[model samples]
Target: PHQPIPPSLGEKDLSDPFNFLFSSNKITLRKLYDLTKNVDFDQLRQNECKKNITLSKFWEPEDDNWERFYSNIGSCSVYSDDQMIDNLLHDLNTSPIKHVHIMDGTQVKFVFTFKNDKQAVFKPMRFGRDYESDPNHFYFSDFERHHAEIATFHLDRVLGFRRAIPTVGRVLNMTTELFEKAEKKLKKTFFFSPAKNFCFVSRCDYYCDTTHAICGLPDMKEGSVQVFLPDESAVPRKHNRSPYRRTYSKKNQVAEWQSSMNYCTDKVKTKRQYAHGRRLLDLVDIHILDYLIGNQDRHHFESFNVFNDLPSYAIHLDHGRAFGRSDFDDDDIILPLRQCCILRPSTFQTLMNFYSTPKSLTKALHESLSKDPAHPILAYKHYPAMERRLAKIMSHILECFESRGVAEVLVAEYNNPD
Candidate 1:
């Protein structure tokens, strides 16, 4: 009785505000026209045009440990220490489970405490790699993808953004690893399917019933395991709604920034949160990252609450909605770039480097993900799809440069003494 239900096409609406192809065709056509005529993408790839741009010191890791870790790697900023990161990844992948408890959220998940005392958030696989959602299905209504969570961490590292939490894929024997040690609330939900697969429909806001129960392949279940961040007591975090967030309405409603052409200047840039430091640029970098993965659920962002005079880096979290579709590019995801026309110099340089060689981005991503225990993280088609998204991003940047000179668009970090 734990069968998964296929979405009904009749219930989907093409005009839904959060539809994958919600952006008007006219907007895309205009961008294509501008890209072909005014933008020489090859010239944009050259280093000469970007000579005035210098790396933003604001993105430099603030903690001494992080600074030391980044200094050792020269480019990668994923952790504070290489050995510690390796040990943690190793532990998360192979450590014996001490306890499992239901984690409260919109979707089904669990917090696993290892015998070593390290904790990880486990998001079970809901859909197969080949499964694509109905074209008109709302993005928010989609299942929380386990592979997307794992892949996003690798993508963040490859792009050199280093903002996403570290995640890895692992196969767990539900009977022994989870059900035996799970808390009472989570344990009660466990049952065996007719085919003898271990399954569960844990309590959650959505997708937590018999119809949407997550079942293992016979008995072993594969899921994305992400290490927990620093305790909130030691490092408090502040959450803010993104200015470019979608309305998520069934009606044809849009966010305020979506309707205004001058929203970036007249609205976002004027805010005290974004007016001072690398805040705006950080959002642009996040938008670029989300756009590549086709993630549309970025309604809010989080940052450390420690900085009084400066702003903290936006921690990229909750990316389970990404990598669902590889066929369509969601233009709305890049609204931050389309409106602001500003980018971090370091991010732009990284993008250009990835674009300089064909299939380079995909190749690099594949290599990075190869180290994971669950090696093939994405569907084959998604590799080429990412490259296409990268090209679209470059085109958008070139259009911004053509309309407003590069100097105005490629703004460096503001107010960094170091």
Candidate 2:
């Protein structure tokens, strides 16, 4: 079912929209990305860094209702308001699930269909076993990150960005039927090697007798239940594949990303203009959210109603890697903010106020976790981690002000989401 890429293409030819392909081609968006992974920031610094970044018509203010950067996070197209999602969140929290089944993905997720035909996805807590040893100081990530997912939703809501889907912490009793369904789904989606070696000391996905036994148990795992969109019929609009490693993104950097955007916007054409400004703003918003939560697993932004063309609205999903994920390397700090420093004047004005009140930033999150009946999502150390990261962002901006002057560092732009 997969197509092979045509042999021998030049670099210029790679940027042709006709060259863009996905699904089973072994050539995908990632391949296009790999093609343009240009690290020519050093060359562009003097000529482009101080200049205002240009955006396409889609990200303009006159035709689109472009608000300040922070307010852009408050903008929503899926529902009228956050209260709608809040109601759904409570429903997911207390309602008895009507049906539960397994979903296919890197993580083991159990989907629950509710009485109202609404559904929620449950990702169980997993702390990694010593499947592999990393000479690197810590393991790649922590297990039982269901707390991070819940905390991320709470953070996004509190920050006035209804970007993340509503999620709540809950403990569910797993049934054998659920296990059987999960086993089948996993078998279908992923390749599981035979039990010949049956090694437990490995990290890769493989079939092992011990793993099978654990899958059969009806144990309680504390995880977050995230609302599934559109009753029970709709599925999340996902990318063709999982995200590439941070190394690729780091090499490509914001300069290459902007260049890619310029190329795509220039060649492609469209008439649909619904919430066009917000589309790019959503990218900026997610960048801020990811930095705030220390999440680096974000590769593709999934949509509730994404079509052939870019959709107006996208809900932020997959925050399980935020709190203690090791994938976020040192390069993570300077991404959307410092690495891509062009800020629309209106956004910059508001962002000045936004970051100034750092206490207000985490206030809602702190209050919710403090009053939580169960274990608080943020253990003692996690709080400081956020504080330090936020400060780093603020300081980065401040350093820019000191070096380039505010006018040069922060300028208005029509930056579009690629």
Candidate 3:
């Protein structure tokens, strides 16, 4: 699902909706970008060298739509509109969700459940200056103080991670009288005629879920999306623990996620080097230059939904960012760390890469380190104690190369599927 959107979003910048979303760069100005030959004048000089860089992991996605502190509003009751909720927040942009109406006319639908957190937390909103003086991107309050729980339950039951499209819900209101009473009770309790002709189609593509998260899957160009860890009804602790396969090859057999990391049953493979290894990240933002100067674009399957409760269930979801933790050390046209990392806020793209520094986090980590180096990135090494844990984890990622760090860290995995 394409995503890289940051160029200081607009509609007259939604009127100081409290320091325009508490100093928005949407996480550490991606550590002050640096691409050139016009990366929108290098993210407009990183929207002006991070218009006063000062965020420190504030956290967001409406942080449960607020309850207090818009800098302590009328003291606090918890209800906001932040410029009519950033102008009725909805951006399949120009149209995608097809249909779902009801102020009373009744036309609700259902079935489309997804939950991806992009490795949950490595760089899904990095910021600092103490995360821009912590006003609140994720929270200052609200669970109920009496009943509450949904803070996305720290990503639906604490950091389970694996979503670019795998969401589903059944709280029910899924009208059409519950899709004509669950299609006359699943065709009279299980007679199945194609389950009431399950059909829905759309390709009215406008696109922009971050340019389909890096488009380049000649069948899992070394595919990746593994889960069964912690939960997913865990069972097979061993049976080719992800030998990599599903980029597509089936009437149906099942073998996805493989290219190399040593065919992975968890074979040991870590240490990718380029210009004296460490780590950082970027997606070339100001919100992808405000979706290329607020034009915003996405192609192929931007958002294809059918589960208005469960119209048999369908989802194409925005492109999910490919190319990996790329690299180009010592003489590759100046990129000490091109677009270091950020495949988490759920995003994608293609290429025409480079960087000497026009900024946007060094040309989106120099076009994502020569084009995908960290491959959905996992594992942080110690090596033969990697020269003392890579000189103390690259001096805390070279003390913020603009701020995001920690690409992957497990250390000595004696069976780390935890």
Candidate 4:
């Protein structure tokens, strides 16, 4: 069992930046995960009831009602929305994973049936050179991609966001029959080299040349499994320019993003018939998430606009580029959160409240990764840069608040009638 995030933690002084947020001075991600892991509330209470031992003061039944006892909780796993998701993931993974079909994408991808009927997206480990080191190149290894999927999912869950699709690490054994199917599917994009190399780049009109190119397959025949969101009805919001690799100033990019929102808002029967599609809220949230993960390749995303018939928000996908690098500067990492300072009232409120969340999560991420059996996904120095960028974001928040009053920072908006 976990409790709602405590209010303020008794830190009222605005001048003290370090003291204001975070319940603990420094909590690792795994440590925090252990602390906030979901447990059975009723089961916990029953245990205490059966024992009938220490009930108050030093030994209160904290699990029965942790709200008043644990004042530093930071998870919403107890929430039914998240609980349903967890159960679904468990069932999907528990069932025998069967190949469905391969998806057309920049990265190597496959569709699979889990728990008999439920569908899931699978990405096997492959490496490709997005960047170069003189003669060599920078690449995202299979293990790195798999870890990124699971780690990103965990980070999104802890922060209480549904933007990123839920994912988990798995291994799909290549059966004799399945290997042929997998090989046939992979041939759509990549040409399996006669001389097997650890990794290789190829050419494709619709995708980048790297192995993870939109239509390529993993370099290895036997690769790791990473299940992604498989909602077919979800509509993908296409984009013309790159959202991550900014060609213009932050002001111009933000302006363009807001300008794009008009495409959806204009379709409404009334001033505000729906609240889905390109809302500024979604953009701001993406900006924050991308910045934290050091991901600058948000070329496309799928939204739940059509799936639910209601104006549900978007679910971000294809995050293989995140945490792939060890070295990143403040300018590179913080671009999404930096630059344009304006935000919607609710979005700004969320930003102000959850500013420390990414910071904390990123810290734990670096720590957990360090202990990874193989080479760490990110480098040791990556953590400090994340901290620096977060601090910069905090400074921007304070500056925006002081220069422009709360009202000035708030964007004028119309409520969705539906």
Count clashes in each candidate, considering only residues at least 3 apart in sequence or on different chains.
0, 5, 97, 4
Model 2 residue runs over 4 Å out of place are 1-82, 128-144, 175-218, 231-280, 304-314, 325-333, 344-355, 370-375, 399-418
lDDT of 3: 0.19
Model 1 RMSD vs true structure: 8.7
Which run of 10 residues does model 4 get worst, by summed lDDT? 1-10
TM-score of 4: 0.54
Q: Is candidate 1 or candidate 4 better by TM-score?
A: 1
* Candidate order, lDDT descending: 1, 2, 4, 3
Once fitted onto the true fold, the runs of candidate 4 whose alpha carbons sit more than 4 angstroms away are 1-80, 91-94, 127-146, 175-278, 307-312, 330-339, 344-359, 363-381, 410-418
| Alpha carbon deviation, residue 5, candidate 1 (Å) | 18
Q: What is the TM-score of each candidate against the true structure?
A: 0.81, 0.58, 0.19, 0.54
lDDT by residue (1-418, candidate 4, tens digit) is: 0111111122332332223232422333333234324533334323211111111221221221112112211121112245545544554444575444656535545666543445566655443212211222222221235455655555555445544554544433333223434445344444433343223222223233553432122222222233443233432333333343433343344434334433333332122322423343455556666666666556554443322232334455656666555455324434333333444444443344444454564555544333322223333344555555555555655555455443333443324445
> Residue 333 deviation, candidate 3, in Å?
26
Off by over 4 Å in 1: 1-84, 414-418
Q: Across residues 1-418, which tens digit of lDDT does each residue of candidate 3 receive?
A: 1111121121222221112111123222243233112234233222211122111112113332111112111100111223322221111111122222111110111221112221100011111001111122111110110000111111111111111121111111222322233333222221212223222211112221222221211111111111111212321111221111133323442322122312222232222211111111111211222122111111111111211221110111222221111121111111111222222121111111111111222223223222221111211110111122112222233343324432222111111222
Clashes by residue pair, model 1:
none
Better of 1 and 2 by lDDT: 1
Residue 285's lDDT within candidate 2 is 56
The alpha-carbon deviation from the true structure for residue 123 of candidate 3, after best TM-score superposition, in angstroms, is: 26
Which prediction has the highest TM-score against the true structure? 1
**Which candidate number has the best lDDT?**
1
